[PDB]
Amino acid sequence: ARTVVLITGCSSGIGLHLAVRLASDPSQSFKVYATLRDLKTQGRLWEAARALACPPGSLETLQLDVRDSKSVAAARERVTEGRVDVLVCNAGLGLLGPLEALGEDAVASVLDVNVVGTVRMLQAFLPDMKRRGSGRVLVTGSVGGLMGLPFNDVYCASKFALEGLCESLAVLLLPFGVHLSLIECGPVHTAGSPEEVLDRTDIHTFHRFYQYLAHSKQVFREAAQNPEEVAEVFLTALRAPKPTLRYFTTERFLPLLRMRLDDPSGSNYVTAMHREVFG
């Protein structure tokens, strides 16, 4: 029997490369259901699958809207095997800019996808795992879920939310034999405008926004990992006989994380992060 894996958000980046990595593994032990919001974006996926010689029946695509629990329920029912051994919740959205420049619609959508979308997935798939006494849930995390990042207030909110969600569930799921883990990524190199931002906020906040964006570019140049490397961490977690709640894909944000975790008042972190970003 193959290990049946369902992965959300497979049109690009981590989900794309994880799907083809598992499907093309020399062992032939994985059957991957790769989900996508829009079927028209599936070409990159199929090209990658072809180039990696994924064997027949190792990779299937499904349409999946994580905002719609009927779409989630229909994806569950397409799993012909009647189980999911590994669930990877990876579909997510970013939102970058001054808080007072963000549309309420955009805030609500980022929450609905990143947080409520993950809830919907766990609601649909955890019951069969709990009754079976087995199953693995892997959640794409971020360094932005571990520490606050300026101009990513709502993004960090959504990723911090997953930390809380997963940790709460993990406490309960321990004796069920169902294992949940976050994969904490730093910057990843994958494949609204500045004018509206400036129109919705003060000229000085915009300058702070520019400075943040310049620091972030430099962080990416020093530290960006690719999706192939991140995929290997998902593999490590899914193979571990006794997985931990968090895996770190990189060691590079650990000095900052220590500053945060060694001063619960948050004073050391806020000053240090302010210095890191704005000099």
Ligand X SMILES: CCCCN(C)C(=O)CCCCCCCCCC[C@@H]1Cc2cc(O)ccc2[C@H]2CC[C@]3(C)[C@@H](O)[C@H](Cl)C[C@H]3[C@H]12
Task: Return residues touching ligand X (CB under 6 A).
Answer: 94, 142-144, 149, 152, 186-187, 216, 219-220, 253, 276-277
Nearer to a copy of itself, 52 or 277 (CB): 277
Is 26 one of the annotated binding-site residues? yes
Order of strands, edge to edge, in the sheet holding 30-36? 59-63, 30-36, 3-7, 86-89, 135-142, 178-185, 246-248
Residue 111 site contact among a copy of itself, ligand X, none (CB < 5 to 8 Å, cut-off depends on kind): a copy of itself
Q: How far is the CB of 175 from a copy of itself (least distance, A)?
A: 8
Q: Report the alpha-carbon distance of residue 237 to residue 215 in Å, rounded.
A: 31
Structure tokens at 90: 């990876």
Nearer to ligand X, 94 or 266 (CB): 94
Nearer to ligand X, 161 or 219 (CB): 219
Nearer to ligand X, 176 or 220 (CB): 220
Largest Cα–Cα distance of the chain, in whole Å?
60
Identify whether 155 is a catalytic site residue. yes
Residue 153 site contact among a copy of itself, ligand X, none (CB < 5 to 8 Å, cut-off depends on kind): a copy of itself
Closest CA to 124 of 158, 157, 160, 78: 78
Q: Looking at this protein, which amino acid is placed at residue 68?
A: D
| List of residues 6+ apart from 203 with CB closer than 8 A | none
Residue 187 site contact among a copy of itself, ligand X, none (CB < 5 to 8 Å, cut-off depends on kind): ligand X
Helix ranges, the chain (H): 13-23, 43-51, 69-78, 104-111, 117-132, 153-173, 194-199, 203-223, 227-239, 254-262, 267-278
Q: How far is the CB of 135 from ligand X (least distance, A)?
A: 26
Q: How far is the CB of 277 from ligand X (least distance, A)?
A: 6
Q: How far is the CB of 208 from a copy of itself (least distance, A)?
A: 6
Residue 99 site contact among a copy of itself, ligand X, none (CB < 5 to 8 Å, cut-off depends on kind): a copy of itself
Q: Which of 155, 212, 247, 269 is catalytic?
A: 155
Closest CA to 152 of 12, 279, 8, 277: 277
Is 58 one of the annotated binding-site residues? no
What percent helix, strand, coil does the chain show, rounded to 5?
Answer: 55, 15, 30
Catalytic residues: 155
Q: Which residues are annotated as a binding site for substrate?
A: 142
Q: Which residues are annotated as a binding site for NADP(+)?
A: 9-37, 65, 159
Q: Which residues are annotated as a binding site?
A: 9-37, 65, 142, 159
